[PDB]
Amino acid sequence: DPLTRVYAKDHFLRLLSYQHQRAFEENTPYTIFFVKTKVSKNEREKALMKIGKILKECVRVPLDSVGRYSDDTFALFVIGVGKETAPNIEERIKNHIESIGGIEYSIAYKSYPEDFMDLEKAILDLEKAVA
Numbered sequence: 001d002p003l004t005r006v007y008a009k010d011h012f013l014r015l016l017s018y019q020h021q022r023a024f025e026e027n028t029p030y031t032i033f034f035v036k037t038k039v040s041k042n043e044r045e046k047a048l049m050k051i052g053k054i055l056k057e058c059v060r061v062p063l064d065s066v067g068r069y070s071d072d073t074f075a076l077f078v079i080g081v082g083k084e085t086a087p088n089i090e091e092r093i094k095n096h097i098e099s100i101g102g103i104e105y106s107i108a109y110k111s112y113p114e115d116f117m118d119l120e121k122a123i124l125d126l127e128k129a130v131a
């Protein structure tokens, strides 16, 4: 069921590279978000399923995707979201994490095409920004 699905890293990145090509072809923007959790070992399990659900909430169309990027980082891309509306989505994610309380995290986003057009560069930059 798509409404519950979270993709493994390489699966996620394959879907992202497809979307990157489609965005180029159709002149449509999209935005990538990274969220890294920075909590103690024995609260990692809890925060993982919670931030996962929060990012799933941002999914507006079936192509939008959430991925387990690393053992403590999630990634998300949302099609049709450019520089104008990307900050609103980031604030919503932060508000949901705030509503939970007690989760330490870093968040960053890159919008195509205004922030980047080279996908591997965006990905490297997002890693550094939440590290």
Ligand SMILES: [Zn+2]
Binding pocket: 057, 096
């Ligand atoms: Zn909500």
Ligand SMILES: [Zn+2]
Binding pocket: 118, 120, 121
């Ligand atoms: Zn490059």
